[PDB]
Structures are given as C-alpha cells and as structure tokens.
Amino acid sequence: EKIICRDVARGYENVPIPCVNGVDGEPCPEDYKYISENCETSTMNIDRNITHLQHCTCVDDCSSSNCLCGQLSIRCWYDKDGRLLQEFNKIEPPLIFECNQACSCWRNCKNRVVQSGIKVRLQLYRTAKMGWGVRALQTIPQGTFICEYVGELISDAEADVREDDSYLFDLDEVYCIDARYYGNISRFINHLCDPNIIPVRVFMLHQDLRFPRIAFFSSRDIRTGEELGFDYGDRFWDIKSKYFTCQCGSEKCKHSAEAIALEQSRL
Amino acid sequence: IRTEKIICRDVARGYENVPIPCVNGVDGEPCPEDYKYISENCETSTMNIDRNITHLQHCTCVDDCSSSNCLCGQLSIRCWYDKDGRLLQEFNKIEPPLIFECNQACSCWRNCKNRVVQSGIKVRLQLYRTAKMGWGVRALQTIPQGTFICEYVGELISDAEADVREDDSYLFDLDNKDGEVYCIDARYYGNISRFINHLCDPNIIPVRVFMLHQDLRFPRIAFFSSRDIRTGEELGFDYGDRFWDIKSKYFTCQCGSEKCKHSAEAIALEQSR
Amino acid sequence: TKQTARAST
Amino acid sequence: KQTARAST
Ligand SMILES: C[S@@+](CC[C@H](N)C(=O)[O-])C[C@H]1O[C@@H](n2cnc3c(N)ncnc32)[C@H](O)[C@@H]1O
Ligand SMILES: C[S@@+](CC[C@H](N)C(=O)[O-])C[C@H]1O[C@@H](n2cnc3c(N)ncnc32)[C@H](O)[C@@H]1O
Ligand SMILES: [Zn+2]
Ligand SMILES: [Zn+2]
Ligand SMILES: [Zn+2]
Ligand SMILES: [Zn+2]
Ligand SMILES: [Zn+2]
Ligand SMILES: [Zn+2]
Ligand SMILES: [Zn+2]
Ligand SMILES: [Zn+2]
Known part of the structure; x- marks a missing residue:
C-alpha cells in the first residue's frame, strides 16, 4: 500500500529500495x-x-575454463548472464573467487557478478506475522544475484556477548557479521x-579467508511479489525457539510451535 | 608523415567511469604496459x-549537504564545492585546505553535494605521446576551473621504503613534515x-581529501583544474623543488614555458653569479 | 555451541 | 631526501 520511504539505502545501491506498509501503523524502521x-x-x-591476491592472466572475458579465478572454485559458476549454473551445488555451495584488481582482465569480465551489486528491484514491506520483510518487485530467474549480507564485522567472542542476536x-x-546497528x-x-x-561465500577485492562476503542468490525462479527468504539454520533456531517460533506458513515448517511440540513427543 | 594511432581503447580496462584511450602520433613506442x-x-x-566506522566525523544533514550546518563542510571551514561539483572561485589554490567529503556514517544520501572525488572521473582524458616528455595526459574537452580531474592513485608506502626505491619517477x-x-608510489601500480x-x-593542483576513512596519515590526492582548460591541452602540475633538486642532475625541464624554472637555461642562469 | 543465535550457511 | 618525490 503506502510508500513510506522512496529508498531505504539513501542512494547507496545501484537501485532504490522503497519501503511500504499496508498492514499496520509501524513506521519505516530507522533504528x-x-x-x-x-x-x-x-x-x-x-x-x-595486493600481492596476496590469486589472480588470472586472461585476455578474454574470463569465460574459458583456463581462468585461474574460476579454477579456484573448480570452475566459474556463472553463466553468460551472471546467473549460477543449474548444476551449482545449492546444498553445500563452493567458495567463489571473483576476479579482482590484480587480474589482467577487464572490469566487465564474466566473473564479477557480486562485486557489481544489486540489479533486481526489491521492496521492504510489512509482513503479517514476521515484522518487516523483503520481497521481489519483478520476476527473478533461478541463480540470480539478489543482494549481499552486509553489516558490522565482529569477532566470535564479541558476537557471543551481543545483547541483540537477531x-x-x-x-x-x-x-x-552483525547487522543490528549497521546493515x-x-x-x-x-x-x-x-x-x-541461498547464501554463498564470495571473495572479491581481498582473499582474507576470515572474511568471506555473503551473497544471496535465488534458488529457484521467483514470482513478482514473492517474499524472499533463506534458511537461517539450526545454530539460530536451537537458541531462538525458546523465545519465539516460526511463523511461516509452510506445510514443510520445521520450527513452528506445533512442529517442535510434535518432535518433543519423542518417546 | 607518421599517422596518429589508437594503441589502447582504454588503459583503465573498464575500471573508470569513462575510457581513457592511448594514442601515439610521434614515434613507434607501444602502449605502456610496465x-x-x-x-x-x-x-x-x-x-x-x-x-x-565509529571514528568518523560525520554529518546529520537530511538535505543535500549545501547548508552551513553540514559538519563535514565545516571540517574545511566550509564545503568548497559549488552545485556542479567545482571548487569555488575563492578556493585557496596556494595553500589548499584538507577536504572532508561525506561518508558512510553521515545521515545524507550518496548523491549529496559533498561527494565529488569519491564519485570518480567525469572528464574525458587521453594518454598520448608527447614530443619531449614521453607519455602525457591531455584533455579531450574544455574543463572549467575547479573541476575534479582524477586522483593520484598508487601503492602506499612508508617514507623509509620510498627512500630506497630504485625508480623515483x-x-x-x-x-611534507618528517616523522x-x-x-604513493605509482611506478608499479598506478x-x-x-x-x-x-x-x-x-x-x-593537488588537494588532500578524506572519504571512506579519516586516517590523517593517508590523505588521498585529488587533482582539480586551477583554471579553465582548453580542449587538447596537456595536463600538468608543479611537482615541486623536492623533485627537481634531485632530478635535475639527470634531466631538465622540457615544458617549454617562458616561465620555466627548471630548464637547462634557467638552471644555468641561476648557477651564473 | 555458542551463547547467541547466528544465521549461517 | 634520497629519492625524488612530487609533493604539494
Ligand atoms: C534478521 S531479522 C529479519 C527482519 C525482522 N523481521 C525485522 O522486522 O526487522 C530476524 C528477526 O526476524 C523475525 N523473524 C524472521 N523470520 C521469522 C520466522 N520465520 N518466524 C518468526 N519470526 C521471524 C525474528 O524476530 C528474528 O529474530
Ligand atoms: C610521473 S612521470 C610522468 C609520465 C612520464 N612522462 C612517462 O612517460 O611515463 C615523471 C617523469 O616524466 C618525465 N617528465 C615529466 N615532466 C617532465 C618535464 N617537465 N620535463 C622533462 N621530463 C619530464 C620525467 O622523466 C619524470 O621523471
Ligand atoms: Zn580470468
Ligand atoms: Zn576476469
Ligand atoms: Zn581473475
Ligand atoms: Zn517455518
Ligand atoms: Zn552534510
Ligand atoms: Zn553529505
Ligand atoms: Zn557528511
Ligand atoms: Zn619547465
């Protein structure tokens, strides 16, 4: 319904990300x-x-199997349009090494998808039961880069003492990455x-293995208006389900009050 | 008569907002690749x-950062950019101030008025073979005074490392202080x-600028036009006497200006006394 | 296992 | 210094 922010990213992304709320009176989130x-x-x-970067010598568009950067993930997993190959392992994704400033290739080579940023039209919107969410404003083919999980880099020890772990x-x-205060x-x-x-670990301008960057790609074709979502994993739910349970929605739900209660009846 | 040849469509290999071609109409030297x-x-x-990020001074503006209340502007007494991204006529070109552009901690938008250098190259430039000074850079368009041209980009090194670099060109x-x-060494990476x-x-002229960080050890060097520049004009700055006192033993200035202070003739004249 | 919840691959 | 440097 009502557009309450023309762009939550304040011009920092390639495209604007508007915010709407057609559900309740909650104002645009600014905390x-x-x-x-x-x-x-x-x-x-x-x-x-710069001398610690593994890098390629390609004089083409980095579409050949001889690209060193591609070989660092067995092969480049991007097709000619920047989408993950159908065969991409979506259960145990590999680490992707994109081309970088040490590579001989051009900035528009075929192995630069995440570093090129957001291209799909997304929207921050009020959900019925799960606060704010993100949905697609266009159809999105399978394998398309959506966005990166960006926030504050912190140590494991600091993360263990953070008051908000959402x-x-x-x-x-x-x-x-803590996206509570900065995200x-x-x-x-x-x-x-x-x-x-699905989240994929990616290296771009540096190859410090402590700090992979987290890229989300579509795991199937996505319809206009569909809510985006990933599986946060059991290292989230084992801790959080004492406080709240899952409000999808889905007949496959594994983390609802009912699901948990059912499994609990385990004699 | 030698033709002028285009020998690289873009020396930046797509990394800049605009291509930077290379030509040579003087000799047989191929595009520099070293x-x-x-x-x-x-x-x-x-x-x-x-x-x-918590060490960044930053502004609270929700306008376009053109008001005198922008903290980032105030860190240089005032923002020195006009509405079109050019230094004000009154900018001090003798003793430029340090410029603090807006950053990721500021409340303003990415296209506020205090983001000129971080937005990159907009003018059309060309790498070309000069008659006497090897390769140089010239403008392919008119450039008004105060316009951002490009940044001096290279390998960051200590003063001590700089002192042992074999190639000092x-x-x-x-x-300029000690300690x-x-x-920036642009010999290997630039x-x-x-x-x-x-x-x-x-x-x-070179101007010290802060963007994504404010570590005072590492200002970024931005070149702005010091006057209106005509199409085809070679771009040039005054490298300063801390370059020429050393280099003039090895070669002298070929700029060809009646104001030249570093030609063989100039040096010879000063020597005489 | 840690004190706080984290999303993960 | 030992080596030439451009400078402001
Ligand atoms: C990373 S945030 C996502 C954005 C959050 N909905 C908001 O409004 O800011 C994670 C928090 O969202 C809520 N949430 C996310 N997915 C949920 C789900 N499937 N069921 C219930 N709450 C959920 C929980 O409050 C969770 O701690
Ligand atoms: C930073 S480089 C400029 C690019 C250089 N012309 C080239 O072909 O790579 C500095 C060197 O260019 C030459 N140079 C630059 N300005 C000069 C001048 N006014 N007269 C003579 N040589 C100059 C000197 O060899 C100097 O050490
Ligand atoms: Zn390659
Ligand atoms: Zn490449
Ligand atoms: Zn590469
Ligand atoms: Zn669920
Ligand atoms: Zn401001
Ligand atoms: Zn600003
Ligand atoms: Zn600011
Ligand atoms: Zn001269």
Whole structure:
C-alpha cells in the first residue's frame, strides 16, 4: 500500500529500495544505520595486500575454463548472464573467487557478478506475522544475484556477548557479521522453511579467508511479489525457539510451535 | 608523415567511469604496459589504516549537504564545492585546505553535494605521446576551473621504503613534515595520474581529501583544474623543488614555458653569479 | 555451541 | 631526501 520511504539505502545501491506498509501503523524502521559495504568497529586488519591476491592472466572475458579465478572454485559458476549454473551445488555451495584488481582482465569480465551489486528491484514491506520483510518487485530467474549480507564485522567472542542476536551471520577463530546497528537490505530478510534464496561465500577485492562476503542468490525462479527468504539454520533456531517460533506458513515448517511440540513427543 | 594511432581503447580496462584511450602520433613506442593499472590505492605491506566506522566525523544533514550546518563542510571551514561539483572561485589554490567529503556514517544520501572525488572521473582524458616528455595526459574537452580531474592513485608506502626505491619517477609525498609520513608510489601500480607531466605553468593542483576513512596519515590526492582548460591541452602540475633538486642532475625541464624554472637555461642562469 | 543465535550457511 | 618525490 503506502510508500513510506522512496529508498531505504539513501542512494547507496545501484537501485532504490522503497519501503511500504499496508498492514499496520509501524513506521519505516530507522533504528540502524544503512551501509552498503561491511564496516569495522575494532582492529580486524583485513589482508588487503595486493600481492596476496590469486589472480588470472586472461585476455578474454574470463569465460574459458583456463581462468585461474574460476579454477579456484573448480570452475566459474556463472553463466553468460551472471546467473549460477543449474548444476551449482545449492546444498553445500563452493567458495567463489571473483576476479579482482590484480587480474589482467577487464572490469566487465564474466566473473564479477557480486562485486557489481544489486540489479533486481526489491521492496521492504510489512509482513503479517514476521515484522518487516523483503520481497521481489519483478520476476527473478533461478541463480540470480539478489543482494549481499552486509553489516558490522565482529569477532566470535564479541558476537557471543551481543545483547541483540537477531541479526548475526556466522562467517564459516570464526568471525561474524552483525547487522543490528549497521546493515543493508539483507537485515530484513526473514527465515523461510521453504526458502527461495541461498547464501554463498564470495571473495572479491581481498582473499582474507576470515572474511568471506555473503551473497544471496535465488534458488529457484521467483514470482513478482514473492517474499524472499533463506534458511537461517539450526545454530539460530536451537537458541531462538525458546523465545519465539516460526511463523511461516509452510506445510514443510520445521520450527513452528506445533512442529517442535510434535518432535518433543519423542518417546 | 607518421599517422596518429589508437594503441589502447582504454588503459583503465573498464575500471573508470569513462575510457581513457592511448594514442601515439610521434614515434613507434607501444602502449605502456610496465605497470599495473589500478583505480584505487593499493597496499603491499600492512598500513593499519584506521577504518573504524565509529571514528568518523560525520554529518546529520537530511538535505543535500549545501547548508552551513553540514559538519563535514565545516571540517574545511566550509564545503568548497559549488552545485556542479567545482571548487569555488575563492578556493585557496596556494595553500589548499584538507577536504572532508561525506561518508558512510553521515545521515545524507550518496548523491549529496559533498561527494565529488569519491564519485570518480567525469572528464574525458587521453594518454598520448608527447614530443619531449614521453607519455602525457591531455584533455579531450574544455574543463572549467575547479573541476575534479582524477586522483593520484598508487601503492602506499612508508617514507623509509620510498627512500630506497630504485625508480623515483612516480613518487608522491602525502605529508611534507618528517616523522611517520607516507608516500604513493605509482611506478608499479598506478592510475592515469602516473602519466601527468610536470609543467612550470601548471593547470591542475593537488588537494588532500578524506572519504571512506579519516586516517590523517593517508590523505588521498585529488587533482582539480586551477583554471579553465582548453580542449587538447596537456595536463600538468608543479611537482615541486623536492623533485627537481634531485632530478635535475639527470634531466631538465622540457615544458617549454617562458616561465620555466627548471630548464637547462634557467638552471644555468641561476648557477651564473 | 555458542551463547547467541547466528544465521549461517 | 634520497629519492625524488612530487609533493604539494
Ligand atoms: C534478521 S531479522 C529479519 C527482519 C525482522 N523481521 C525485522 O522486522 O526487522 C530476524 C528477526 O526476524 C523475525 N523473524 C524472521 N523470520 C521469522 C520466522 N520465520 N518466524 C518468526 N519470526 C521471524 C525474528 O524476530 C528474528 O529474530
Ligand atoms: C610521473 S612521470 C610522468 C609520465 C612520464 N612522462 C612517462 O612517460 O611515463 C615523471 C617523469 O616524466 C618525465 N617528465 C615529466 N615532466 C617532465 C618535464 N617537465 N620535463 C622533462 N621530463 C619530464 C620525467 O622523466 C619524470 O621523471
Ligand atoms: Zn580470468
Ligand atoms: Zn576476469
Ligand atoms: Zn581473475
Ligand atoms: Zn517455518
Ligand atoms: Zn552534510
Ligand atoms: Zn553529505
Ligand atoms: Zn557528511
Ligand atoms: Zn619547465
């Protein structure tokens, strides 16, 4: 219904991400800082040494199997339009190494999808039972990059003491992204037991293995208006289900009060 | 008569907002390839730049950052950009102030008025073979005074490392004081600015700028036009006497200006006394 | 297992 | 210094 923010990203993304609410009186959420790239709030010393980048020597568009960067994930998984190959492993995704500033190739080579940012039209909107969510304003073919999970990089130890644990994402001495205070559009993506996106670890401008960047891609074709969602995983629900249970929705739901109660009856 | 040949459609390989072609109508020298083109500064050892987001001074504006209440403007007494992204006529071109552009901690939008350098190259430039000064950069369009041209981008290094670099033709000091000071070396890694020649009558000036961080050790060097620049004009800055006192033993200035201070003739004249 | 909830692959 | 550097 009513458009209450023309762009929650304040021009930082390639495209605007509007906010609407046709459900209740909750105003546009502003209790966080929108950022389009990950931030630091303590000394992390991400390894940005250009000489530590593995890089290719391609003089074409990096579409051949000889591209070193592709070979670092056995092959490049992007088709000619920037979408994940049908055969991509959606259960145990590989780590993707995109081309970078040490590579001989051009900025528009075929192995630069995530670093090129958001292209699909998305919307922050009020759901019926799960607060704010994100939905698609267009059809989205399977394998399409949607957005990155961006926030504040923190240590595992800091993550263990964070008072609000509703926006934490484990990268993998493990580090985490907390999108509570600083985050992007991904902070509003809800959990679905029937998910339509999946997270993939990606390297771009650096290859510091502590700090993969988290890219969401569509795991199937997505219809206009559909809510986006991923499976947050059991390392979220084992802790959170004491406080609330899952409000999808789905006949496949594994985390509803009913599901949990049923399994509990385990004699 | 030699023709002018296009020998690279874009030396930046798509990394800049615009292509930067290379031509040669003078000799048989092919496109320069003995360096890595990068659009942003790189590191080759740990610099520990302060990137903590909570250390950023930042503004509370919800307008376009054109009011005198923009904290980021105030950090340079005032924002020096006009509505079209050009330095004000009154900008101090002798002793430029440090510019603090808006950043990710600011409440304003990405297209506020205090984001010129971080938005990149907009003018059309060309890498070309000069008659006497190897490769240089010239304008393919008219450029009004105060216009952002490009950044001096390269490899960040310490003062100490700079002192032992064998090739000293592409070094730029970030700070003129002594102590813990740093330099950009564009010899191995650089952008288009690495090809900008010295001119005793310069048409661009370097200005220290802060964008995504505010670590005072690591200002970014932005070139702005110091006057209106005509189509086809070679771009040039005054490299300064901390370059020429050393380099003039090895070669002298060919800028050809009646104001030249570093030609063989100029040096010879001063020597005489 | 940790004290706080985290989404993960 | 030992090496030449451009500077403001
Ligand atoms: C990462 S946030 C997502 C955005 C959140 N809906 C909001 O309005 O800001 C995670 C929080 O969303 C809510 N949530 C997400 N998925 C849910 C689900 N499937 N069932 C119930 N609540 C959910 C929970 O409050 C959870 O702790
Ligand atoms: C930063 S580079 C400029 C690009 C260089 N012309 C090239 O072909 O790579 C600096 C070097 O260019 C030459 N140069 C620049 N300005 C000059 C001038 N005014 N007169 C003579 N040589 C100059 C000198 O060799 C100087 O060390
Ligand atoms: Zn390649
Ligand atoms: Zn490539
Ligand atoms: Zn590559
Ligand atoms: Zn569910
Ligand atoms: Zn402002
Ligand atoms: Zn601003
Ligand atoms: Zn600001
Ligand atoms: Zn001269």
